[PDB]
Subunit: 489 residues, 3 copies
């Protein structure tokens, strides 16, 4: 007596945004933005990071007496460093090309300390010099990785040292120069005035001269110490020559592991976890293509956008409004086996149903849409943090401009794409329902009476079999032609 | 006995383009590209700019005698400079890290001058030197903000001078070193050979030595002056030591207000006018998201693209070729809606408008336009940087980045406008067909279709009838028997 | 009598992808990505490049004896260099601002060597020194474009030299400083210790001092040579002065032409062809806006993406199967005249047809869409690739990040745009067929019997003229209204 065509409604309350309307309630929705972390600094690929504590990279490499817990350091995934470390250079001074050194350390996962110039080889000089700035238990001391050379008796002969890199990998060597505060200091320490420090390799040639002047007091001293570094290649020799003011190295750091890493600025401590993407606030465990947790990330991470919600409409519109009418008035609550379906009402009882073909096709289409949006984003290993000195403000501003531009582009594209796709899927569902209605109408032809709310009354008597035939798409119009014709007039 | 469904046409001649057609006439349109400007140089947020005129930043800071009008500069919003300033370094020479100083000046306002080393403290030297390159009224002169130390009598005692920064903010200090032309000049001015100039702070350590050589004549002189600068922190000291060739400062430059600003290269003058976005050709006053006036801007300005027109379709097509309905074309009689009815019966014809559909479509189009416009992020930013003559690669990098972003935004904006125009022009047609189908479903067999846009009834149906058809409360059973009777015959 | 509305099918096997479906067979497709090249290095705009071979730029400019074939070189479009050239600085040393020199010299396209300081004017010094580091036929030699000054007898007087730039354009000048190995070498070659080299222009001002120390042996020598360069403006003067350790120039390079060029790092040889875009693997000639051959290109080249397929659907969906049914049951194979058409079966004879107005409109729309996608992308001359020193790794990382970000942006945008436009095209074709069906039905009205498979069965006897009339759009309802009513009731 009746067969109606409609769609499915539920008790959901998820709202989605569209380029034409705002706050539209849908049956189902998928979130493609991640907003949750665990709030803990954790391991990366199972390898604990290098927790420097209150030390700095220079303090670790030079061997500050307050950083004695890092004399031997195992393999690491990344480096954790405070924004303002307290234990850096105990003796005041500088460190040439510090940022380049940090960037180099952002690509090595393990070192190996090798003794290259033993302290006992300097038989003609004093090697037991220290200062009150780097004091240990009230006694003056010095760095644990470098040697301070001083006159023995009243003579300072020319000091020579060499090292042939037979270790098996690239080696990093750090030396220093000393700038005293007065000519009295220079005479007391080296016995001669007008000295030089010469360092030379196969591709490096550097000569330095000490500067003697009165400077403001830092850590109680008016003197400074300038440190420089180099990368010694395999089977390559490095030569040291100096008449005074040479802070010679005793160890060299050879690169052993090599990989991808970075420096992260936090103020926390490592805990027991395991993650793939790490942020200064916490770790991220997701498969979504976007997130808004933090811009500075280390690892394989989703894209960062400046949005608050990015929801893709998967299901139909929720119009809870409902003999029983069809899809013109609204959705159906009693149909739970699919998306688009039927309701039949004859002399053998009423009931709902579902159309498997149309629902399956729509489901496949929506799944493919979501997959196309999600799996077309390329994810790699990147470290966003970068360090620039106070004389490189233009470079820092260029970096900041690039990051801001990329962020703006991705935010705009993501938001507009979500809005347009939501509009298209909301039109897709209505098109599907109307196509089903039109197919049923063209199959039924004049044998029925289109009421106008969404369904038809038959002009004949139809049992269950004819209802299934209409639902299955195998109506036999000529069989009921004569019977249905009589009742029309 | 007729009721037609159709849309609205006028005499507008605006033109829009879509992804499938070009040069399409529409009833209404919105331009989202700004192409006009005031033509003057304005004040940004009320504050007048700093007009240097014929002077450079170096000339203003060092105190060129021809820039004596800028000795007390008030608060400024941005800096106006010429491409090739005439009045810079009157005495030939160079300025170390000039572009970094300009970049620092990009983010400072008002500024304040304090005297740190009075010219009268140098009791053991001569302080009244001058040159003909910087001459006033024919007589030789020198920079206003600097002091040239020369021997007094026949001796040049060691020169010392210190300043403790108790002003209350960071400070900018500039000093210099003199490179003479021959040894006789050196002995005439300083009485000694082999001199040095040493400058030291808590984080700076610099020693410089004069170089004496024959050089080409610039402004009549074969000698040069080299200028350097530093940023002094609060409660920090700066020390000066020299045995010759020292150009000591007298005034120390102190930062008063900070913020966002920039440097604009222009050949104009300031006029009485105000804005929030500034361009070297004029001032922009618009709310649109895109503009094409000039790539270099200072302030809160729209995105710059290389396009001539970006027009959004907010209305229907103009097809006024005609009573007939929406199949043939639009109507001119409708003046209070987009979709409506024209009715014709025994008691007088006329037009009308469907309020619900028009309101829904108007809200949708307004939401679309607002979504396109309001999703753009506008923040203060100043395009334009300076690079020296040994930094071609950095300038090329900056140019490539800006060009890439420009290309991305241009392509995105054009394609988005095309696609949205196509979507809107399909949306209107779908709305009109929806109204037609709704009316047909309500009217059912009681009427006859015409393939033109309207229906001819099978009964007599007055204004209450026709309001009900427009209202949506047509009652089928009232005329079912009457309207059937005429249909068979 | 019948008239069915349908579309066109063929035997194509090309497939496109959409946002809702994958591997959809289409009648006509357009590939907008270029994947092929000629595999050879050719001339840009009809001008051969500069083939350095085994000598590097520094060795070419200094005049290394092993690349004497480059003493005079003609016009060039770009430069072909090897990744690790063999003949560079024969005498071990360094070269200041080398990358800046390469970047500047990548925009020159022609030089002109000019003798600025002849070797016969040094009448108080010995100018025949040479080394075994770069020797010819077993005898010591030196760089061809530079002069090594050594003491004459037992004296080294102060050396002075100047040049005024009257050539006509900017001129490039290179000089050097020699760093000995011990004091004995210094006293043997220059007779005094504590020397300097001073170079001065209207803008430049430089003073240098040699460094004497023991260094590891490279090419058997413990000494090094340091080279510097400058640009001399028109009507400017350059001054030289030295008490020792000066490698003076003899020639100067002036800039004849100026333009767009770059440096290619390849190990191939020039062959006879001509193109507008060049890659290290080959050359590209195309009108498509995308390619995936090689990231580093020189010329006006399409955008580079990380994709393997970018196909725009131009035609219809290809459902092969089709009394003769209409567009409900599938496409039509025998209608090779257009996209949307008809089919009739009357007494006089059956046959196919093709609607002209709808097909023309659809063709114009699709062509406009393709032209909008292609022609809106701006192509400019660009040379991708920069050289950075081993102490500027941060700048190299910055450049790499910029290039990678732009590559990802363009890749994502291109793939999503293709996926979207394919869906709109496939929906557009179905909309067109539906619109034609509805137009015929509403024009032609109750005089027929809709069959539901895509066409109608006329109730009257429609001859040919009526068939062209309904196909025309000028059907006459009142003519057959009375006759149709008679048979319909029965
Ligand atoms: C080794 C020592 O005690 N040196 C001090 C020096 O001693 C003189 C000795 O050389 C001479 O033969 O005999 C006289 C007595 O007749 C002295 O014993 O005397 C100086 C004062 O005249 C000291 O001055 C003060 O030293 C302070 C700090 O000492 C340390 C430091 O903690 O920095 C430690 C060592 O003295 C020294 N390290 C060495 C030699 O390896 C360093 C050294 O001076 C650095 O170069 C400091 O820049 O200094 C303060 O530096 C204070 O300002 C200064 O007046 C000598 O310490
Ligand atoms: C103070 C003065 O006039 N000096 C000139 C010098 O005169 C001498 C006297 O001071 C000395 O005791 O005895 C000798 C004789 O034994 C002189 O009587 O004579 C020089 C030539 O022999 C001058 O040369 C010319 O100076 C020019 C520049 O003068 C200025 C200038 O206009 O730039 C200004 C000052 O006169 C001069 N000195 C100071 C302290 O400012 C400076 C200075 O010389 C340089 O400009 C900077 O180092 O320059 C031209 O430079 C010209 O080329 C040169 O021949 C002495 O000016
Ligand atoms: C001219 C010459 O033969 N010099 C070699 C020198 O002979 C001395 C001569 O200068 C002196 O007047 O008289 C004594 C005899 O009383 C000698 O005859 O002897 C040196 C060894 O003690 C040399 O040693 C080796 O030279 C190698 C290469 O030599 C050359 C070269 O081809 O690079 C030869 C050039 O004539 C010489 N001069 C010039 C102006 O180019 C250069 C020059 O020394 C370079 O600056 C080297 O840095 O060197 C190797 O250099 C090897 O290491 C060295 O031991 C003198 O070559
Ligand atoms: C949509 O709903 C949110 C609450 O989730 C509300 O803040 C916002 O104002 C709503 N927007 C409109 C246009 O009503
Ligand atoms: C350094 O050691 C390698 C291998 O033992 C050797 O070939 C090389 O000659 C050595 N270097 C020097 C300067 O002898
Ligand atoms: C559209 O009109 C403009 C001028 O209004 C004209 O320049 C252009 O050629 C026209 N486009 C076409 C396709 O005719
Ligand atoms: C500079 O002045 C501040 C003011 O309190 C003082 O603390 C500081 O010690 C002074 N500097 C020196 C070097 O005395
Ligand atoms: C039309 O609809 C409105 C709905 O508010 C109703 O108030 C009015 O009585 C209706 N009029 C007719 C003639 O149906
Ligand atoms: C599409 O076809 C290709 C071969 O042409 C095949 O590799 C791929 O798996 C197919 N994809 C789907 C979804 O069937
Ligand atoms: C260099 O030549 C130009 C033109 O011949 C001349 O004007 C200039 O004075 C010359 N330079 C010098 C230092 O004389
Ligand atoms: C078809 O329409 C065109 C329109 O001008 C007309 O010229 C032609 O005669 C028509 N054909 C028939 C068979 O009516």
């Amino acid at each position: 007596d009746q067969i109606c065509i409609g769609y499915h409604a539920n008790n959901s309350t998820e709202t989605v945004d569209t380029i034409l309307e705002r706050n539209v309630t849908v049956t189902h929705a998928k979130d493609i933005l991640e907003k949750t972390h665990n709030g803990k600094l954790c391991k990366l690929n199972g390898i604990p990071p290098l927790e420097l504590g209150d030390c700095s990279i220079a303090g670790w490499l030079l061997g500050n007496p307050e950083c004695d817990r890092l004399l031997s350091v195992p393999e690491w995934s990344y480096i954790m460093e405070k924004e303002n470390p307290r234990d850096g250079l105990c003796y005041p001074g500088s460190f040439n090309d510090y940022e380049e050194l940090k960037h180099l350390l952002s690509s090595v996962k393990h070192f190996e300390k090798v003794k290259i110039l033993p302290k006992d080889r300097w038989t003609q000089h004093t090697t037991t010099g220290g200062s009150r700035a780097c004091a240990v238990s009230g006694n003056p001391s010095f760095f644990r990785n470098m040697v301070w050379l001083t006159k023995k008796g009243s003579n300072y002969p020319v000091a020579k040292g060499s090292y042939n890199n037979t270790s098996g990998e690239q080696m990093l060597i750090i030396w220093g120069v000393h700038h005293p505060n007065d000519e009295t200091e220079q005479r007391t320490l080296y016995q001669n005035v007008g000295t030089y420090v010469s360092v030379g390799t196969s591709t490096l040639n550097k000569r330095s001269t000490p500067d003697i002047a009165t400077r403001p007091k830092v850590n109680g001293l008016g003197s400074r110490m300038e440190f420089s570094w180099t990368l010694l290649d395999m089977w390559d020799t490095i030569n040291f020559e100096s008449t005074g003011n040479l802070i010679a190295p005793e160890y060299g750091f050879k690169i052993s592991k090599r990989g991808s890493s970075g420096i992260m600025k936090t103020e926390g401590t490592l805990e027991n976890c395991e993650t793939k993407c790490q942020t200064p606030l916490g770790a991220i465990n997701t498969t979504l293509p976007f997130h808004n947790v933090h811009p500075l990330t280390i690892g394989e991470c989703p894209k960062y956008v400046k949005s608050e919600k990015l929801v893709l409409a998967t299901g139909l519109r929720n119009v809870p409004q409902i003999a029983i009418a069809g899809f013109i008035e609204g959705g159906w609550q009693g149909m739970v086996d699919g998306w688009y379906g039927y309701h039949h009402s004859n002399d053998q009882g009423s009931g709902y149903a579902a159309d498997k073909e149309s629902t399956q096709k729509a489901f496949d289409g929506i799944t493919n849409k979501v997959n196309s949006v999600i799996e077309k984003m390329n994810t790699q290993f990147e470290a966003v943090g970068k360090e620039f000195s106070n004389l490189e403000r233009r470079l820092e501003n260029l970096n900041k401009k690039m990051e801001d531009g990329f962020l703006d582009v991705w935010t705009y594209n993501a938001e507009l794409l979500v809005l347009m796709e939501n509009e298209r899927t909301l039109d897709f569902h209505d098109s599907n329902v109307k196509n089903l209605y039109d197919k049923v109408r063209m199959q039924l032809r004049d044998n029925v009476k289109e009421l106008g709310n969404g369904c038809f009354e038959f002009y004949h008597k139809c049992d269950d079999e004819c209802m299934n035939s209409v639902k299955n798409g195998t109506y036999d119009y000529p069989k009921y032609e004569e019977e249905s014709k009589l009742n029309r007039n």
